[PDB]
């Protein structure tokens, strides 16, 4: 009789690598590198993400006519913006800062559109009408949706009755003593008429600012010669990806449990850590060579 | 000593190809298989875990006048990426080496184990194979597999068959 020893072998390659040799086969292996891709981006948390195609975040927040204001979206885990903006800022202007705003809206997940100011109660003395031809909508002249053009020394103040953070955006007309006044924040801008080049078929600009106030705060406004009053505070309830895929990552979705990814690193929410490597396979068995 | 695995032994990791006057075939062991699979699965579970990530808003925006910040951010990000690449590559290579060597050591261990209880009733031939001076039926196969090979039972056999 006879007794021999050995190990089971099969007919698969499953290439792996190590110090001994490159491109060595193995009976059984597990790959820690993933490449599944092109899965259409979907609800990360079972909710509709806030797509903003055809318009920029600026105009979206500032009532640009083109996108119809996307009136209803109560919850949105993340915001996906078209890599190439379209009509992102109707009026030629210059904001204050679009990082302290663009970054704060990466965490909130709901909103309560609230008509911060009553456009029919206590300012008939004004001239609420106004329009810019270069900002005409649907082929007809219009100005904006989230705020209105605008002579006594007008004044007004919110009180923050609702126990939540209330956001206020506005600007001034750059064809006065505009002075936002917070309980713990202040500034004082002035008008400036000066020759400027023509851009988007206009001979000036209007610059937008924005401040944040918490419960127990009541800002007070003022101005003499110009004021772009707000008309809807995008009250909060507390990521950005540029992509063109139809209806996560900028270039699709991933459904796997491995820790390392080869798709573009940028993502939102829990996801595998990115790495710059091609093949990462572990050996869970024995070599495979006949005889 | 051991070079390549047989195409037989449809299931298992280590086993014996016995042969006797009455029959022949393959047979797989249990304890070594369980130990190896358990240890390798534990290795995989350990390596896959110990990795967690929060809301990593990697994408960042910077103004025209703040290119300094852009350069700083790029430095930080690329450095992190390179560090993680190097670490992961080294870890994976090390794990592959330390599993292959362990498998080889385990098979060698099983070999010496089977050698142990057959001091003289058998005679080594090579390639990790043995044969007995005495002839035995199927049951001796189970006896050696379970380790219950009673040496005195067949020791009396005339080992002078030469």
């Amino acid at each position: 009789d006879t007794i021999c020893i050995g190990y089971h072998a099969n007919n698969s390659t499953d290439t792996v690598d190590t110090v001994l040799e490159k491109n060595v086969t193995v009976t059984h292996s597990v790959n820690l590198l993933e490449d599944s891709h092109n899965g259409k981006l979907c609800l990360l948390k079972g909710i509709a993400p806030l797509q903003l195609g055809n318009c920029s975040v600026a105009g979206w927040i500032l009532g640009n006519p083109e996108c119809e204001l996307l009136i209803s979206k109560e919850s949105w885990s993340y915001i996906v913006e078209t890599p190439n903006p379209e009509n992102g800022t109707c009026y030629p202007g210059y904001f204050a800062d679009y990082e302290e705003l663009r970054e704060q809206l990466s965490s909130v997940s709901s909103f309560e559109r609230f008509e911060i100011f009553p456009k029919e109660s206590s300012w008939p003395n004004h001239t609420v009408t106004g329009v810019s031809a270069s900002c005409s909508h649907n082929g007809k002249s219009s100005f904006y949706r989230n705020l209105l053009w605008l002579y006594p020394n007008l004044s007004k103040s919110y009180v923050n009755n609702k126990e939540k953070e209330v956001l206020v955006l506005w600007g001034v007309h750059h064809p006065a003593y505009v002075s936002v006044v917070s309980s713990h924040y202040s500034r004082r801008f002035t008008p400036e008429i000066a020759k400027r080049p023509k851009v988007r078929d206009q001979e000036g600009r209007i610059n937008y600012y924005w401040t944040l106030l918490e419960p127990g705060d009541t800002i007070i406004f003022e101005a003499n010669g110009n004021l772009i009053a707000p008309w809807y505070a995008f009250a909060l309830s507390r990521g950005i990806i540029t992509s063109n895929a139809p209806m996560q990552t900028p270039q699709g979705a991933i459904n796997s449990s491995l820790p390392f990814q080869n798709v573009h690193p940028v993502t939102i929410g829990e996801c595998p850590k990115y790495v710059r490597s091609a093949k990462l396979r572990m050996v869970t068995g024995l070599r495979n060579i006949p005889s | 000593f051991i070079e390549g695995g047989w195409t037989g032994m449809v299931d298992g990791w280590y086993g014996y190809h016995h042969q006797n006057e009455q029959g022949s075939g393959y047979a797989a062991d249990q304890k070594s298989t369980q130990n190896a699979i358990n240890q390798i699965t534990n290795k995989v579970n350990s390596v896959i875990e110990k990795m967690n990530t929060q809301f990593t808003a990697v994408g960042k925006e910077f103004n025209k006048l703040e290119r300094r910040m852009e350069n700083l951010n790029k430095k930080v990000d690329d450095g992190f990426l390179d560090i993680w690449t190097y670490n992961a590559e080294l870890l994976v290579l090390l794990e592959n080496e330390r599993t292959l060597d362990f498998h080889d050591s385990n098979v060698k261990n099983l070999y010496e184990k089977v050698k142990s209880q057959l001091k003289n009733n058998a005679k080594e031939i090579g390639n990790g194979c043995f044969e007995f001076y005495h002839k035995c039926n199927n049951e001796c196969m189970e006896s050696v597999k379970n380790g219950t090979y009673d040496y005195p039972k067949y020791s009396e056999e005339s080992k002078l068959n030469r």
Partner: antibody, heavy 109, light 90 residues
């Protein structure tokens, strides 16, 4: 490689041209008009042995290494044994695999 | 274990078993008079030296040859009771 066979009755199969001490020989009978039928086999060392089911006891096989030659005792001739006998060698030293590659002229008993 | 078998013409043949055998199979050909010569061995794998004109494939109780006389198929899984198949006229 060279092999020859010559020959109760005695039958021997001499061979040369290779390492006779590191291989296992075998024997296959041939019917007058039917297919071939296995007979026996011995491992290289000269301990492990087997036989055809319908022959155990009748025909015995023994080997040496000095002469590089084997022989079947082939005792107890019977009328049905009118078969053509051959010689053959395994194709490798590994136990699990087997195939008879080297084939000789055989013998017509 | 038991065995059995089935210019310008396509020479194809089949040999089958009544039990599962993975790879321990070969093929032996012989013309009348001369001794049998090797052929594809190890489950249809080509045997060197001999002409490559001969070939075949198939596995798992079903084997086939792909190419005048007779041929034989042999199984070598359960070792002690070897066995050769029957003749194969063409």
């Amino acid at each position: 490689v060279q092999l020859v066979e010559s020959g109760s009755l005695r039958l021997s199969c001499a061979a040369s041209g290779f390492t006779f001490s590191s291989y296992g020989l075998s024997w296959v009978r041939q019917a007058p008009g039917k297919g071939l039928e296995w007979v026996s086999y011995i491992s290289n060392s000269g301990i492990s042995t087997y036989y055809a089911d319908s022959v155990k006891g009748r025909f015995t096989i023994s080997r040496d290494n000095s002469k590089n030659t084997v022989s079947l005792q082939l005792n107890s001739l019977t009328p049905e044994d009118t078969a053509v006998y051959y010689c053959a060698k395994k194709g490798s030293t590994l136990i699990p695999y087997t195939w008879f590659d080297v084939w000789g002229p055989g013998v017509l008993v | 274990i038991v065995m059995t078998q089935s210019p310008g013409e396509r020479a194809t043949l089949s040999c089958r078993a009544s039990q599962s055998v993975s790879t321990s199979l070969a093929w032996y050909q012989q013309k009348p008079g001369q001794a049998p010569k090797l052929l594809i061995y190890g489950a249809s794998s080509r045997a060197t030296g001999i002409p490559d004109r001969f070939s075949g494939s198939g596995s798992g109780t079903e084997f086939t040859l792909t190419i005048v006389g007779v041929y034989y198929c042999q199984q070598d899984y359960n070792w002690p009771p070897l066995t050769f198949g029957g003749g194969t006229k063409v």
